[PDB]
Design an enzyme around this catalytic site. Structure first.
Site, short mmCIF file in Angstrom:
data_model
loop_
_atom_site.label_atom_id
_atom_site.label_comp_id
_atom_site.label_asym_id
_atom_site.label_seq_id
_atom_site.Cartn_x
_atom_site.Cartn_y
_atom_site.Cartn_z
N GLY A 1 -8.90 -19.69 -21.37
CA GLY A 1 -8.77 -20.31 -20.05
C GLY A 1 -10.01 -21.07 -19.62
O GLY A 1 -11.13 -20.65 -19.89
N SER A 2 -9.79 -22.20 -18.95
CA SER A 2 -10.88 -23.01 -18.42
C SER A 2 -10.66 -23.24 -16.93
O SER A 2 -9.53 -23.27 -16.46
CB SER A 2 -10.97 -24.35 -19.17
OG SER A 2 -9.69 -24.89 -19.45
N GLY A 3 -11.76 -23.40 -16.20
CA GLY A 3 -11.68 -23.55 -14.75
C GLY A 3 -13.01 -23.73 -14.04
O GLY A 3 -13.69 -22.75 -13.73
N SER A 4 -13.37 -24.99 -13.79
CA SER A 4 -14.49 -25.36 -12.91
C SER A 4 -15.84 -24.67 -13.22
O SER A 4 -16.69 -25.24 -13.90
CB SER A 4 -14.09 -25.12 -11.45
OG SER A 4 -12.91 -25.82 -11.14
N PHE A 5 -16.02 -23.45 -12.72
CA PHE A 5 -17.28 -22.73 -12.88
C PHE A 5 -17.52 -22.32 -14.34
O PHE A 5 -18.64 -22.45 -14.84
CB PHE A 5 -17.31 -21.49 -11.98
N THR B 1 -15.63 -21.19 -18.56
CA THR B 1 -14.59 -21.23 -19.60
C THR B 1 -14.66 -19.94 -20.41
O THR B 1 -15.75 -19.47 -20.74
CB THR B 1 -14.78 -22.42 -20.54
OG1 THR B 1 -14.68 -23.64 -19.80
CG2 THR B 1 -13.73 -22.42 -21.64
N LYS C 1 -17.18 -15.47 -21.89
CA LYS C 1 -17.11 -16.40 -20.77
C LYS C 1 -18.37 -17.24 -20.76
O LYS C 1 -19.47 -16.70 -20.63
CB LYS C 1 -16.98 -15.65 -19.45
CG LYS C 1 -16.78 -16.55 -18.23
CD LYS C 1 -16.38 -15.78 -16.98
CE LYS C 1 -17.56 -15.11 -16.30
NZ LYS C 1 -17.17 -14.55 -14.97
N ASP D 1 -12.55 -9.66 -4.07
CA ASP D 1 -11.45 -10.48 -4.58
C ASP D 1 -10.49 -9.67 -5.44
O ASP D 1 -10.07 -10.10 -6.51
CB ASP D 1 -12.01 -11.68 -5.35
CG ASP D 1 -11.01 -12.86 -5.44
OD1 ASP D 1 -10.04 -12.92 -4.65
OD2 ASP D 1 -11.21 -13.73 -6.32
#
Ligand SMILES: CN(c1ccc(F)c(NC(=O)c2cccc(OC(C)(C)C#N)c2Cl)c1)c1ccc2nc(NC(=O)C3CC3)sc2n1
Ligand SMILES: CN(c1ccc(F)c(NC(=O)c2cccc(OC(C)(C)C#N)c2Cl)c1)c1ccc2nc(NC(=O)C3CC3)sc2n1
EC number: 2.7.11.1
Lengths: 263, 254
Positions: free
Chosen positions: B17-21, B23, B36, B129
């Protein structure tokens, strides 16, 4: 960066076993836990050093196949808290209740044990007592490696069947090495693949000690199962070599099992 | 202690998974691990601090219901290594592939999740969260709480209506997860507007429809859920009580 658990938080329930090296209880601390604690009133310097060392080693480990260390307690009485394991040891499975694992699983248990021993050795930790009694089959599917001194069931004969010849001979003050651990693993592979302990045709302990020591006795590799692959039998033979420096180290052992793991 | 993994030891594998802040990849380090990695390889001061802070928290935790931190790397890239979780997140089970668990097992998931949260709180750690996707049902057996990433559906009104985080705000999130488990659905499914959900929950006009819980859901559980979801912060129980409460409940059942 501390792991001391304040007193009065740990509840101690069942007593699972006692040695002169501590007493293990099932306990409660943020869930089920095992509590190994010195049942003594005044810890002697040697015992306190023994404690400090075990804690020192356990807090260097964070790996799925090593028994999870969670905390210690000096306040009331010296104690080490680890995760509570569930099911039984690999020893109990193979040689007491005699569970019959499929080959895919036997090979998995090998893999995981190998993963854990690769990890320890990477951190330059030599187990010095790897054997099926010390391999817990948690939830019946995750190998947790530990030192379960008398918390799990005892071997037939310390524990001689997993000692590399150079260890048995006791040539010098420290015959232990990554390679003695490898030999021990070698026997565990024997157990997995045969379902039996080695040297079952010999009723005398001192004779086993003597002969394994001189290279006269070794595991009968013909007792392995038909469906055990040749790669695994070959790897087993390399691990059980009588000459320390002729044995492979865990990175390769792990790599070997991983390769035969596919197909 | 020191948890720095040397360079060229982890073989990075499949991208997960990849996402902004960040990977995340599946990797090999004495078996399967998750790696990560920070994206931009010339990291900024604040990003570096974020890394320090995560590793700072992660290494305070040693508990079976918390994701296992294994190490970090600074060379060449900033990367945090944990255990690799086999299976699916609670979110994925309940909302994507819609697994139908038997009630006894749903109650157990709540037990374990609360078990972990109890631990975290004991070490003065606030999750901030908690939600179904941050709960991984490892090997279809053991809950592993983590942070696998606003998450509005799980935010308590005081957070929604702006340090408003507290053990109680964590407890509210848990209240929403219980709702998820017991209804097999997300809250406010009949509303399609995010801004309105924010406004209404903050004003107290909206709260989860507890009538949607399964018929076999125990009354004791349905009540705990109402207590954890209380709009007022100080009326919510802390986790020792929640855990004792689930404990008792699960004994009249197995
Ligand atoms: C016996 N035992 C237990 C409890 C606390 C401990 F600290 C230890 N210590 C070790 O295992 C230990 C000791 C020395 C070195 C060491 O580290 C290396 C890396 C060398 C290794 N390996 C370790 Cl890790 C042991 C436990 C723990 C859990 C447990 N669960 C049980 N469950 C059951 O008996 C029920 C199913 C029947 S018994 C048990 N014992
Ligand atoms: C995304 N992920 C992963 C990897 C490395 C990490 F360092 C983290 N970090 C956290 O989860 C994290 C971040 C901040 C704080 C924090 O601590 C608190 C106290 C809030 C907690 N809890 C944490 Cl813990 C996350 C991982 C890790 C494992 C993993 N396994 C997967 N398996 C699969 O996806 C396939 C079988 C289906 S994905 C994955 N991601």
């Amino acid at each position: 960066d501390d792991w001391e658990i304040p007193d009065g938080q740990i509840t101690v329930g069942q007593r699972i076993g006692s040695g002169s090296f501590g007493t293990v209880y099932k306990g409660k601390w943020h869930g089920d836990v095992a509590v190994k604690m010195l049942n003594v009133t005044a810890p002697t310097p040697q015992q306190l050093q023994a404690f400090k060392n075990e804690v020192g080693v356990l807090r260097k480990t964070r790996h799925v196949n090593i028994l999870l260390f969670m905390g210690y307690s000096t306040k009331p009485q010296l104690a080490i808290v680890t995760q509570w394991c569930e099911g039984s040891s690999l020893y109990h499975h193979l040689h007491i209740i005699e569970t019959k694992f499929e080959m895919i699983k036997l090979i998995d248990i090998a893999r995981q044990t190998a993963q854990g021993m690769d990890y320890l050795h990477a951190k330059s930790i030599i187990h010095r007592d790897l054997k099926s009694n010390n391999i817990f089959l948690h939830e019946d599917l995750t190998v947790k490696i530990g030192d379960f001194g008398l918390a799990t069931v005892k071997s037939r004969w310390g524990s001689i069947l997993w000692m590399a010849p150079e260890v048995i001979r006791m040539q010098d003050k420290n015959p232990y090495s990554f390679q003695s651990d490898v030999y021990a693993f070698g026997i565990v592979l024997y157990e997995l693949m045969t379902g039996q302990l080695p040297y079952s045709n010999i009723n005398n302990r001192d004779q086993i000690i003597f002969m394994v020591g001189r290279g006269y006795l070794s595991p009968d590799l013909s007792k392995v199962r038909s469906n055990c692959p040749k790669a695994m039998k070959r790897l087993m033979a390399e691990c059980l070599k009588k000459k320390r420096d002729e044995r492979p180290l865990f990175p390769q052992i792990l790599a070997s099992i991983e390769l035969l793991a596919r197909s």
